Amino acid sequence: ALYEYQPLQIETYGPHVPELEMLGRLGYLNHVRAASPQDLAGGYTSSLACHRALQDAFSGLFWQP
Amino acid sequence: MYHNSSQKRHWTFSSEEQLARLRADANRKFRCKAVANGDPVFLEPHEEMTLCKYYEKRLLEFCSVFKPAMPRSVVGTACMYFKRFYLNNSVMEYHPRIIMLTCAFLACKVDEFNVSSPQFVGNLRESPLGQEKALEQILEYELLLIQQLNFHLIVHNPYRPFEGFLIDLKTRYPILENPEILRKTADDFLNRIALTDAYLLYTPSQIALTAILSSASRAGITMESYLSESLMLKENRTCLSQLLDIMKSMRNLVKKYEPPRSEEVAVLKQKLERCHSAE
Amino acid sequence: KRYEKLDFLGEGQFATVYKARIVAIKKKDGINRTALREIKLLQELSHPNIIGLLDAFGHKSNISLVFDFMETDLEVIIKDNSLVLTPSHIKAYMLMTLQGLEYLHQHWILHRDLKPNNLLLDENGVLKLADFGLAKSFGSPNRAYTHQVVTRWYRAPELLFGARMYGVGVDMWAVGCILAELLLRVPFLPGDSDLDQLTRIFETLGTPTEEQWPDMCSLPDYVTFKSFPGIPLHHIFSAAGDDLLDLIQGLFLFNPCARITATQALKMKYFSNRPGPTPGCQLPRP
Numbered sequence: 001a002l003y004e005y006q007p008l009q010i011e012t013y014g015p016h017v018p019e020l021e022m023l024g025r026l027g028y029l030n031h032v033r034a035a036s037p038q039d040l041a042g043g044y045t046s047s048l049a050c051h052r053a054l055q056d057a058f059s060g061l062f063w064q065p
Numbered sequence: 066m067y068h069n070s071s072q073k074r075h076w077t078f079s080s081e082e083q084l085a086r087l088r089a090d091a092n093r094k095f096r097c098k099a100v101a102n103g104d105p106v107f108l109e110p111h112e113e114m115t116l117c118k119y120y121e122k123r124l125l126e127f128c129s130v131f132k133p134a135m136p137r138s139v140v141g142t143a144c145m146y147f148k149r150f151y152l153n154n155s156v157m158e159y160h161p162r163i164i165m166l167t168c169a170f171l172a173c174k175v176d177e178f179n180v181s182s183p184q185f186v187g188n189l190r191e192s193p194l195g196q197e198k199a200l201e202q203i204l205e206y207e208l209l210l211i212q213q214l215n216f217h218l219i220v221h222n223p224y225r226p227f228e229g230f231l232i233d234l235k236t237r238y239p240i241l242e243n244p245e246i247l248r249k250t251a252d253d254f255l256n257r258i259a260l261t262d263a264y265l266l267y268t269p270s271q272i273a274l275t276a277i278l279s280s281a282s283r284a285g286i287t288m289e290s291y292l293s294e295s296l297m298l299k300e301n302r303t304c305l306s307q308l309l310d311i312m313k314s315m316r317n318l319v320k321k322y323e324p325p326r327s328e329e330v331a332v333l334k335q336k337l338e339r340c341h342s343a344e
Numbered sequence: 345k346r347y348e349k350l351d352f353l354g355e356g357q358f359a360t361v362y363k364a365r366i367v368a369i370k371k372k373d374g375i376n377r378t379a380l381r382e383i384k385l386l387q388e389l390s391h392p393n394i395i396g397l398l399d400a401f402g403h404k405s406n407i408s409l410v411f412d413f414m415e416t417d418l419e420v421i422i423k424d425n426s427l428v429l430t431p432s433h434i435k436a437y438m439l440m441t442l443q444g445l446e447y448l449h450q451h452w453i454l455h456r457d458l459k460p461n462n463l464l465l466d467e468n469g470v471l472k473l474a475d476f477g478l479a480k481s482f483g484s485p486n487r488a489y490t491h492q493v494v495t496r497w498y499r500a501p502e503l504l505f506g507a508r509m510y511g512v513g514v515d516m517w518a519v520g521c522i523l524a525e526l527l528l529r530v531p532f533l534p535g536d537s538d539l540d541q542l543t544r545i546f547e548t549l550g551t552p553t554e555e556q557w558p559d560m561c562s563l564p565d566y567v568t569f570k571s572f573p574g575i576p577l578h579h580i581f582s583a584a585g586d587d588l589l590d591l592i593q594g595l596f597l598f599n600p601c602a603r604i605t606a607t608q609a610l611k612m613k614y615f616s617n618r619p620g621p622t623p624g625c626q627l628p629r630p
């Protein structure tokens with residue numbers, strides 16, 4: 001009787017969204033405004049905004065009513 | 066998230082025919098209620114549609130000059146509220162001039178755009194007694210509007226998907242140099258798309274992508290490779306065909322849209338006023 | 345209406361709650377903004393560890409929200425001196441809390457009011473996050489936040505220093521405070537004011553430095569504090585194993601960015617270690 005992590009399975013009906021940590025490596029973060037030192041101090045990073053924008057762009061792009 | 070949102074499950078419809086059926090059913094039940102309560106006074110569904118388009122323009126005008134500036138998401142949510150309300154309700158029962166203000170009020174609350182009621186009603190171009198009366202009507206209709214929306218308040222607008230698509234084009238599509246050139250024109254097309262029933266017929270991502278691709282086609286830039294390669298629609302060719310015909314249908318909807326005419330709006334407004342005198 | 349009033353469950357800041365047929369009904373500005381926030385957020389969310397909004401109705405300017413009926417909450421469990429909280433029970437509570445929080449965070453929503461009384465439990469032992477009257481969406485730069493969120497005993501230092509932009513770190517720090525409460529059976533940092541809360545945090549965990557919290561001084565209400573060393577974690581939670589201490593440290597990292605997310609916390613070896621989390625039907629009830 002143990003626990004094993006399994007990621008959440010939610011169909012976005014759209015293209016694959018790159019992982020949050022990889023956005024810097026893949027060059028996405030060059031097209032969003034960087035988080036200010038106050039934002040970083042509070043824990044807000046530009047990667048959050050970029051990831052949410054990408055997810056909303058790709059959400060349900062292929063889905064049919 | 067849109068992909069598990071109430072908008073996708075309950076407020077995206079199969080075709081314009083289903084929308085017309087819902088609106089005609091609204092007209093029919095209003096007629097039945099009116100005749101059972103106790104004729105050229107009634108308007109046909111097409112007249113109701115003309116009035117609804119005119120008052121959606123009026124709601125956009127109200128939200129554009131609203132101080133303090135409403136975030137564009139609030140305006141989109143309010144316009145979506147108006148469309149959804151008049152899918153299943155007749156302008157003859159609930160006046161669009163007040164329902165649109167209730168839509169703006171509820172959208173301001175829902176989208177966490179903190180404005181006090183005195184400020185909201187001071188935005189209205191009315192006398193102070195007129196402003197207070199309008200506030201009373203808005204308070205009367207707030208719960209009615211929420212009930213008619215089936216308590217589905219979060220509205221997914223196409224603008225954040227538009228920004229995400231712009232980020233993706235800037236990153237993974239070097240062939241398109243400076244995707245920001247596509248912004249304003251796509252924005253324009255987006256607005257035109259907002260006038261039709263597409264917001265009830267397609268996903269916000271599809272709407273944003275259609276606007277971007279129409280902007281690209283207007284400039285001669287072709288990015289079929291974006292969908293083919295960058296979006297990796299290679300294993301599922303039918304998915305690419307489905308996407309392309311969805312955009313084609315959006316463009317057709319924008320093509321066939323005709324704005325309401327001022328004289329026709331005036332006569333239909335007079336008819337609506339007579340309808341609201343009684344019943 | 346289709347519900348019949350059964351009991352009186354309590355009185356709140358913005359509404360009173362009754363039992364009904366089993367459901368719980370929560371009854372010039374217009375409709376109350378807290379009720380609208382709850383409605384709009386819980387309509388778009390569907391997860392076993394998030395409170396379910398079954399219905400919503402009202403009359404004129406008053407509004408009632410119908411949720412599922414919750415047996416108890418974590419505050420009663422913690423305060424019940426007759427309940428032995430085994431490591432497995434603690435792991436189960438943290439696991440359900442973190443799964444609900446993970447689902448909430450993927451949908452870009454912060455609870456911002458995490459505390460043991462907001463973690464409700466049903467008769468089946470399913471922990472659900474409730475009281476979304478302070479919950480808000482995050483991940484958009486043009487979204488003004490309030491730093492005076494979260495109860496003080498569970499408020500994160502970035503909030504206590506006045507962060508108006510934050511992420512999942514607020515919920516994670518509240519989760520760490522809840523874990524400490526479950527381990528010690530008393531509030532971890534029961535400050536009497538904002539300054540006292542910060543002082544207690546720094547006396548117990550050590551005053552953070554520029555290395556631990558790179559942009560500490562950039563926060564609007566940054567109070568320059570004395571450099572206390574802080575009690576070692578194994579001294580505070582004497583019965584906490586190394587994996588649990590690692591989880592606590594990750595949850596209590598002063599840097600919100602380095603502070604572990606719900607997914608990262610779920611991936612920690614503590615949850616996959618022996619013993620496993622107790623099933624819901626075996627969780628202690630008051």
Ligand SMILES: CC(C)c1cnn2c(NCc3ccccc3)cc(N[C@H]3CCCNC3)nc12
Nearest residue numbers: 353354355356361368370411413414415416417
């Ligand atoms: C989701 C909400 C509506 C809900 C669901 N169940 N439930 C219960 N059930 C019983 C109980 C008793 C003690 C501790 C936990 C639960 C009580 C209650 N009381 C409110 C009163 C106002 C201040 N906050 C708490 N709210 C609820």
